[PDB]
């Protein structure tokens, strides 16, 4: 019941012959998978910690200029020289100047002066790469027990840490058995082309090549005294005051400029180690050693009384909180959805098996009814509690929402979205293969095209398809226009 009020829960119904249902654990999301007889349980990856990462290189965002020194030679003589030109910490630019008898030189013409300056950085910005032998994913597995304090609670579950070295694991549950994960973390979010960069207690994940491309003076990265800065001319600016003499100016603080240069990069907490949020992981659930643990129990004769008003979630599932009345046994909770004058039931129990645990705490069930007027009967006797509800939506709206959600999943996760709820069907493999090929082509073509430029190119290609004599219109327009407009509309995230 940890995966109840999140608003991004997406149910995974059904499992294969070998019972290895699959899910793709999205960082903000949670799955709430279930089965025909297994205990329904919800899974959500939470933190994906990384640690013992090394510093690769250091960039400089604020500079100080000291010891400005200048020399000038007469015209028709070599470029002016300082003994300070060849020091590692000096930026020095030759230039020209006019001088004649007014400057004490006999021969008129353009002379050469140079202004060397010592450059020392004040606040570097480090870019630290993360390795693969230290990445540690952390997954909570909270099982729907209908416990008193399980709805919305974020501190209930059994941690199953999964590192790339020890990919597989088996999370032992309190009383429901064992659930095994064969998760594959190497195919998830790529941590090879992603380099962390940190400034002033802020850490971001940026593409590695982009981090090298950006124009700031860098250094070796290994910590030491006086890191000899390379490409340091980007900060120092050498203004020439209309050919009479030269001035040296330091550009200023680049913190704000970088805070704009990182517009599309995700952010991660950097308080202790690196709690890298904003990831995604795929995994398959063995889900064959689990036990319902409630089948042997009986059915409670005594009545049931609720404690909170019925309130459904954003996904149209009734949630019921009911406390058992006086009796001397734990049991199964009977349950049957009924219409006002129709006894056909179409409402399932998303909770596996509602069982009273300690006789004193309310056990809160969570079950979805069919859309329309349909009351709920819980107790076995004729004095049973009869909670009545009228579901608002319709099946067509649910289908539309499902299509939109699947479109979002395929637009975000890309190639691996076809394996989300995969039962192992052959058709899903073919779909994933063709989507992988088309997605590779699309990424190659559209890599780096911005949010507005995608929409522009999409509408342009849609018009080109529409006004075409050849029978490539029905392909180009539909496919490229729809795909590109959708990706432009939902690309920024």
């Amino acid at each position, epitope marked *: 019941m940890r995966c109840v009020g999140v608003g991004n829960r997406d149910f995974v119904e059904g499992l294969s012959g070998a019972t290895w249902v699959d899910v793709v654990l999205e960082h903000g999301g949670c799955v709430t998978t279930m089965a025909k007889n297994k205990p329904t349980l919800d899974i959500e990856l939470q933190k994906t910690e990384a640690t013992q990462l090394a510093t690769l290189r250091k960039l400089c965002i604020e500079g100080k200029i000291t010891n*400005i020194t200048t020399d000038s030679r007469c015209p028709t003589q070599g470029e002016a020289v300082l003994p300070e030109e060849q020091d590692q910490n000096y930026v020095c630019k030759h230039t020209y100047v006019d001088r004649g008898w007014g400057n004490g030189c006999g021969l008129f013409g353009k002379g050469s002066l140079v202004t060397c300056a010592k450059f020392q950085c004040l606040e*570097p910005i480090e870019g630290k790469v993360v390795q693969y032998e230290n990445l540690k994913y952390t997954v909570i597995i909270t099982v729907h027990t209908g416990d008193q304090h399980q709805v919305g609670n974020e501190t209930q579950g059994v941690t199953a840490e999964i590192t790339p070295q020890a990919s597989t694991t088996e999370a032992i549950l309190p009383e429901y058995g064992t659930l095994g994960l064969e998760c594959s973390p190497r195919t998830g979010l790529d941590f090879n082309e992603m380099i962390l960069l940190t400034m002033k207690n802020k850490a971001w994940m940026v593409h590695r090549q982009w981090f090298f491309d950006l124009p700031l003076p860098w250094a070796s990265g290994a910590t030491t005294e006086t890191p000899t800065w390379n490409r340091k001319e980007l900060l120092v600016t050498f203004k020439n005051a209309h050919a009479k003499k030269q001035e040296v100016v330091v550009l200023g603080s680049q913190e704000g400029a970088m805070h704009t240069a990182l517009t599309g990069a995700t952010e991660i907490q950097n308080s202790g180690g690196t709690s890298i949020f904003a990831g995604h992981l795929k995994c398959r659930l063995k889900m064959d050693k689990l036990e319902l643990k409630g089948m042997s129990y009986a059915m409670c004769t005594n009545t049931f009384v609720l404690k909170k008003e019925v309130s459904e979630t954003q996904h149209g599932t009734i949630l019921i909180k009911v406390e058992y009345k006086g009796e001397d046994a734990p049991c199964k909770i009977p349950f049957s959805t009924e219409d006002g004058q129709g006894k056909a039931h179409n409402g399932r129990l998303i909770t596996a098996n509602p069982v009273v645990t300690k006789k004193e705490e309310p056990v809160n069930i969570e079950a979805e009814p069919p859309f329309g007027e349909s009351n709920i009967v819980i107790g076995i006797g004729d004095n049973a509690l009869k909670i009545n509800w009228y579901k608002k939506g319709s099946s067509i709206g649910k289908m539309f929402e499902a299509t939109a959600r699947g479109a979002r999943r395929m637009a975000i996760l890309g190639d691996t979205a076809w394996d989300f709820g995969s039962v192992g069907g052959v058709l899903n493999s073919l779909g994933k293969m063709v989507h992988q090929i088309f997605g590779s082509a699309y990424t190659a073509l559209f890599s780096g095209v911005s949010w507005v430029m995608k929409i522009g190119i999409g509408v342009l290609l849609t018009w080109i398809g529409l006004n075409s004599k050849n029978t490539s219109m029905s392909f180009s327009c539909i496919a490229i226009g729809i795909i590109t407009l959708y990706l432009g509309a939902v690309v920024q995230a």
Partner: antibody
Amino acid sequence: QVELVESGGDVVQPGKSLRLSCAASGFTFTNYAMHWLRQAPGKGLEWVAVISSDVNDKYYADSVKGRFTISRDNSKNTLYLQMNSLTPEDTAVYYCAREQAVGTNPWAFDYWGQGTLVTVSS
Amino acid sequence: HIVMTQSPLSLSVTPGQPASISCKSSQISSWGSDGKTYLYWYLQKPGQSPQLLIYEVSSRFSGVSDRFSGSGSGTDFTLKISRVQAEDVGLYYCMQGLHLPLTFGQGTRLEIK
């Protein structure tokens, strides 16, 4: 946003040693050239010592030459001022100052610490 | 060592009036290589650690009210305070920064008349 805090000021008899620590925060401490400063009550500010960005360019004033030791530890973000052969004239409140972020001088004062007072008497 | 002399040792000005301080050096503070006069000015508020007002002479440090203005060149420099508030009481210290043994001037003071 810069924050400089002092520590080590206490009463002491003449001749005995004492070490003053300047803990700093809010900036990269290792890429700076810290100073020390002092002022006796009823008198003007008096310079004490400087340690450069490179740890091997220390300097001191004439009245305090050959009697004080200044040392930085980058990792612990503290500035150590080991003072020996202290006298009742040398007692004063000691200020720990930062370097000039914007400017041309390799040595200047942007920001002053809170200030600790060391009391010297018999 | 540079002898620093401040013309007033105590200024009593009524609010809304200008107060000017003259600090005359003993040798030239102009660094020949860059042609910049390296002078500094600090205000120590009552019972506070001093802050910085005028790095170099023309320039002015951030977080400083626009009223303060440095002037002068070649061993004789001058501040100006167009309007004096109750918060301008303190101990203005001119200091040279050209040569390594930094010497402050004797502390002047500014009290409201």
